[PDB]
Nucleic acid binder design. Structure first.
Ligand code: K
Length: 125
DNA sequence: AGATTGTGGATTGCGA
DNA sequence: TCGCAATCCACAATCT
């Protein structure tokens, strides 16, 4: 299939995943919860493109900041892991608002650092 | 069997 | 001009 950019929130997948994880009482979430929460918290995805869900899954594995946490520490788990974030491994620029066409046509928090790094609750207009 | 989680090779578009 | 997030896809192992 032809590569296409699709409308999405103007924050990295890393940032959005980290934000919803850090907002979870236990600071960890499963994949399906991460997907539902990202869309809920950043509702700039379109009904006609589902591939952002694959990109979320890809970002959990591709970024060192995400940690696969087994239900039982003593028993690693092929599947169904919780995901946590090591904020020390988040690149600083990863949390910055992105200057995309979608950002520009709407003009958003300038940086998600308060919510990911400093325990603040995310509450967008 | 088919769907899902987890991983990862690889190319793209586009902001800087 | 090109770094790099975004994105398309394949696959292994496991869940339903
Ligand atoms: K990871």
């Amino acid at each position: 299939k032809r590569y296409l950019r699709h409308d999405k929130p103007p924050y990295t997948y890393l940032a959005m995943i980290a934000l919803v994880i850090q907002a979870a009482p236990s600071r960890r979430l499963k994949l399906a919860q991460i997907i539902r929460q990202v869309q809920a918290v950043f509702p700039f995805f379109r009904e006609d493109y589902e591939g952002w869900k694959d990109s979320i899954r890809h970002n959990l594995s591709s970024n060192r900041c995400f940690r696969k946490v087994p239900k039982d520490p003593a028993k690693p788990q092929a599947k169904g892991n919780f995901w946590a974030v090591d904020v020390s491994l988040i690149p600083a620029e990863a949390l910055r608002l992105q200057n995309t066409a979608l950002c520009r046509r709407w003009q958003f928090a300038k940086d998600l650092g308060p919510y990911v790094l400093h325990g603040r609750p995310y509450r967008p207009p």
